[PDB]
Amino acid sequence: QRMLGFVHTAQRMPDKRPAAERRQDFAEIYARFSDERANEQANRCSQCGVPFCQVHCPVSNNIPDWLKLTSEGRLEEAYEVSQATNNFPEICGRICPQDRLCEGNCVIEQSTHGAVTIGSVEKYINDTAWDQGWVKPRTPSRELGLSVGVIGAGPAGLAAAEELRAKGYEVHVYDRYDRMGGLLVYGIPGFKLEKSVVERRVKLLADAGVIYHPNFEVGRDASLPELRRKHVAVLVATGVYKARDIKAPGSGLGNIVAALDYLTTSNKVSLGDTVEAYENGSLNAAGKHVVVLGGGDTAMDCVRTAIRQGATSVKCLYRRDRKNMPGSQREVAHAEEEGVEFIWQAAPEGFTGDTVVTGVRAVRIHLGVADATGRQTPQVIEGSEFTVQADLVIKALGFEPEDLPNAFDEPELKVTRWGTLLVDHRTKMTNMDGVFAAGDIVRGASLVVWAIRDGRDAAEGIHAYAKAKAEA
Ligand SMILES: Cc1cc2nc3c(=O)[nH]c(=O)nc-3n(C[C@H](O)[C@H](O)[C@H](O)COP(=O)(O)OP(=O)(O)OC[C@H]3O[C@@H](n4cnc5c(N)ncnc54)[C@H](O)[C@@H]3O)c2cc1C
Ligand code: SF4
Ligand code: SF4
């Protein structure tokens, strides 16, 4: 039908399970659209000129085109259009925060008509295509005689590997873990993204012809000059893993565990491998009171994965207001509905205890009015300082890059202050010849789709450089 039906229809997301039932299991919380409902929700588009849904999507899919090709049957052509510009569409549709990228700037969203549910239609059109064999690996026609190396198996690494293998090269990936996929499989919990689609996509990648090297750290089992001599070009996509800390009176007691360790062990125990720290360790929250520090999406993941495993009472201390939350806002409402209690504008001061933490003494800060440059300056209130009973606290402040030049044996890699190495904009080439670096280690605490775009751009640049070098 002529697809301008936002006038006489109302937006409604797919099926959801109630809160009293969500708290038990570890599966997802949403469901896939039905056919007659997807063909209706994809019809509310307006095919507007100058589509803001595409200007603000970091990978810049052709959103109106497959929204049209979905609203008229014709699902296979829609799958083609969607896949031809994005390597992991379903993963993006599942995890990408849409209220700030695409759904937050739709033209009918700016006019209080609600937003066309884009990511859910992405999921629908990209998963119903998987069941009927419309997905196939991109095996190169004529195998080109060159070899390219990458470091890391995250989103950027896998995207670059797929692009290079499609061009015709021979790729070799080098991941530190045993199950490749990066923090897509060890950072993000199960209820957000299921660990089955990730292994499905990595199996497809391996079927395309990629060679996998698990349990292979660059620092220990290799060296950057050796790999530089092996292949023709290497892509540093190792991400950021050196976490942050806090120095306060009482910050040396027991049961003060970093967030990444907790999340990793939760992912493992959901998969298996029977780590002992889940049996006898401080990485369980069965019958304890949990308190997490800092904000962001990491805080949301931690608090939810804690409230799933019992956790008689959970609290989260953010040191700003609610509207400045770094992550999305659907997960905040989800956590509130599931049982979490939030404490906005609070900063930790100390930990009271003897050998194990018994409580967290915190202060209450006040934010000034936005400055002429758009920056609020908080100041701690002198009177109100309080203490919360805490059985297990989790520090989830942030993440920073490691010291790569002093660990990759090459002290000539140019670096900024924070650790993100410098790189040109066009070719995505590192200071040194032959080596390239693009992904999350160049940006900071970005999202997945930015990593995908950086990986694709670095792949194109590496192809151009290798062709120009073997050319003459
Ligand atoms: C919805 C959402 C939720 C998010 N949740 C989180 C979250 O909970 N926590 C979080 O931290 N980020 C989170 N992010 C951020 C995002 O996941 C990452 O910034 C991004 O995925 C990292 O991209 P990358 O290319 O650096 O890959 P990464 O996955 O960051 O790359 C890590 C890989 O590098 C490998 N590696 C590391 N060091 C070495 C080495 N020396 N040698 C070899 N291999 C090495 C690791 O083993 C791993 O395979 C989230 C993003 C979104 C959109
Ligand atoms: S969601 Fe809105 S802006 Fe995006 S294509 Fe549809 S009508 Fe245009
Ligand atoms: S990748 Fe993210 S921003 Fe782009 S269309 Fe999909 S959900 Fe929207």
Curated annotation (Swiss-Prot):
SUPFAM superfamilies: alpha-helical ferredoxin (SSF46548), Nucleotide-binding domain (SSF51971). GO terms for biological process: L-glutamate biosynthetic process. The keyword Ubl conjugation does not apply. The lineage of its organism: Bacteria, Pseudomonadati, Pseudomonadota, Alphaproteobacteria, Rhodospirillales. GO terms for molecular function: 4 iron, 4 sulfur cluster binding; glutamate synthase (NADPH) activity; metal ion binding. Coiled coil: none annotated. InterPro entries: DPD_II, FAD/NAD-bd_sf, FAD/NAD-binding_dom, GltD-like, Helical_ferredxn. It catalyses: 2 L-glutamate + NADP(+) = L-glutamine + 2-oxoglutarate + NADPH + H(+). Glutamine binds to the large subunit and transfers the amido group to 2-oxo-glutamate that apparently binds to the small subunit. Pathway: Amino-acid biosynthesis; L-glutamate biosynthesis via GLT pathway; L-glutamate from 2-oxoglutarate and L-glutamine (NADP(+) route): step 1/1; Energy metabolism; nitrogen metabolism. PANTHER family: GLUTAMATE SYNTHASE [NADPH] SMALL CHAIN (PTHR42783), GLUTAMATE SYNTHASE [NADPH] SMALL CHAIN-RELATED (PTHR42783:SF3). Binds 1 [4Fe-4S] cluster. Aggregate of 4 catalytic active heterodimers, consisting of a large and a small subunit. It comes from the Bacteria. It comes from Azospirillum brasilense. This is Glutamate synthase [NADPH] small chain. Residues 36-69 form the 4Fe-4S ferredoxin-type domain. Pfam families: Fer4_20, Pyr_redox_2. Its cofactor is [4Fe-4S] cluster. Its EC number is 1.4.1.13. The keyword Endoplasmic reticulum does not apply. [4Fe-4S] cluster binds at residues 92, 96, 102, 106. Keywords: 4Fe-4S, Amino-acid biosynthesis, Glutamate biosynthesis, Iron, Iron-sulfur, Metal-binding, NADP, Oxidoreductase.
